[PDB]
Each structure stands twice: as C-alpha cells, then as structure tokens.
DNA sequence: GTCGTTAGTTGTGGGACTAAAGGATATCGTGAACCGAAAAATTAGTGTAACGGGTATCCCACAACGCTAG
C-alpha cells in the first residue's frame, strides 16, 4: 500500500458474516427433535445434519462435552437455507510412514496425478 | 462274276516317364500429319483496436483472538 499495487477492498453484499466463539451458547442435543439446538445471539436453531449420523455427528458432540476447540466462525445464507462455516481445530493423524520412502508425483493436464512409489504406479 | 464281311495288319494319334533342394536370364524391323483431349499453372481479388458494466475462471496472500466489566 505504501508503493501502491493493491486497491482498497470493496466488499460484496452476499458476504458470509463472521461471528466469534463468544457467541455460541445453549448447545445441546434435543433428542425429541433429533437435532442439536443452540442460540446464535438469542435465537433458537435446530441443526440439520440430515443423513449425516457419523461424519459431523460426533463433532458437535465433541464440543458439547468440551473435547474439540472452535475458532471464530462465519455464517452464509443462500436464499432460504442457512449455513454455518465452523472453523473446528482438528488434529493431525499419525500413520506408519517411512521418511526414506519417497513418492514421485507429477501433475499434467493429460494425467492430473501420476505417482511412483518403488514398483507401484498410480 | 460281283458285293458285303471278317480278321489281321499298318499308319497315325494321344498319354505316362521317383523323391529332397533351387529358381539368374532377353526379348529387331518405323509412315506422316492434324485434331482432340485433359491436365496443369498462372493470375486476380480483400485487410482492426479498445471500449461500458458485469461476471466466469485463474494465481496469490491472509484469517479463522483473548480478556474484562456491567
């Protein structure tokens, strides 16, 4: 900005507006309605996992019991539906990896990924 | 004496002549002239640059807090 190679941002109107973790409250699992309930600044909200009884199902419960950390999230609205962009802080996964073993990856427009690993081609 | 018949030539024509390997050849003579056919080569004619919003995609960088008081 001192030299000048960037214009001042002109924010759009459909922006997902941000809300901090200091606003999530009354998080519980109401079994009667089969949906998590919470308040986004004094308004009830039934969460629609739908047919997602495993993927993010044990993620909100990982927060109702205080086991996963959440960051300043955002919220989108796309014409009747409402979406929450929750920045959950997930951890790394440890496998049985060998640093000496090297995978040779190449990316081209004819073959998006071509990978060598010893005698294994993918 | 004369005519058809039969058998034995006699001349003439058509059909055979291992298997295995290999496998190169050279091939004259000349009369003219005009018309038609199609296949080929040469020649004659037309040309952009940035712009308004608005929006689809790309690369490229950064963010995604924590504490205190009413």
């Amino acid at each position: 900005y001192w030299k000048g190679e960037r214009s001042l941002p002109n924010f759009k109107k459909d922006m997902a507006f941000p809300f901090g973790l200091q606003g999530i409250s009354r998080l519980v699992y109401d079994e009667e309605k089969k949906a998590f309930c919470f308040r986004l600044y004094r308004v009830p909200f039934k969460t629609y996992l739908g047919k997602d009884f495993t993927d993010k199902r044990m993620l909100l419960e990982r927060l109702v019991k205080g086991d996963v950390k959440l960051c300043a999230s955002n919220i989108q609205l796309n014409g009747g539906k409402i979406f929450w962009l929750a920045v959950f802080e997930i951890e790394k996964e440890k496998h049985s990896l060998k640093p000496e073993v090297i995978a040779e990856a190449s990316l081209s427009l004819e073959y998006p990924i071509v990978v060598k690993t010893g005698k294994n081609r993918l």
Side-chain angles (χ1 to χ4, degrees), chain A residues 4-119:
Chain A
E5 29 182 345
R6 183 151 190 181
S7 61
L8 206 56
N10 202 56
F11 305 77
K12 290 164 129 170
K13 307 179 180 146
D14 53 9
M15 164 180 351
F17 55 105
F19 83 98
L21 59 90
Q22 215 169 6
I24 274 290
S25 200
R26 298 188 187 181
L27 187 56
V28 86
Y29 195 139
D30 176 27
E31 310 59 19
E32 212 278 339
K33 285 174 183 177
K34 302 100 81 187
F36 291 65
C37 287
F38 70 115
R39 278 188 135 188
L40 181 75
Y41 277 175
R42 284 73 83 91
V43 56
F45 270 136
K46 50 198 277 212
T47 206
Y48 204 34
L49 297 318
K51 316 167 73 73
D52 189 70
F53 305 122
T54 187
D55 201 53
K56 323 167 271 213
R57 158 59 188 80
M58 55 218 156
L59 194 46
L60 306 157
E61 217 217 326
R62 262 241 276 164
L63 171 67
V64 78
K65 293 175 164 179
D67 322 298
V68 79
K69 190 171 144 199
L70 171 141
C71 321
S73 303
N74 286 59
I75 164 160
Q76 250 187 19
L77 319 89
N78 292 22
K81 313 206 157 152
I82 305 197
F83 295 100
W84 169 13
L85 320 165
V87 186
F88 297 117
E89 202 143 22
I90 320 195
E91 302 242 3
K92 322 210 177 173
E93 312 148 348
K94 303 179 174 184
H95 290 281
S96 323
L97 301 170
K98 298 183 176 177
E100 55 262 14
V101 172
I102 289 170
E104 280 185 47
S106 171
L107 319 96
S108 67
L109 209 30
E110 164 206 301
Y111 270 91
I113 288 182
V114 41
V115 84
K116 281 327 99 153
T117 299
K119 328 286 152 165

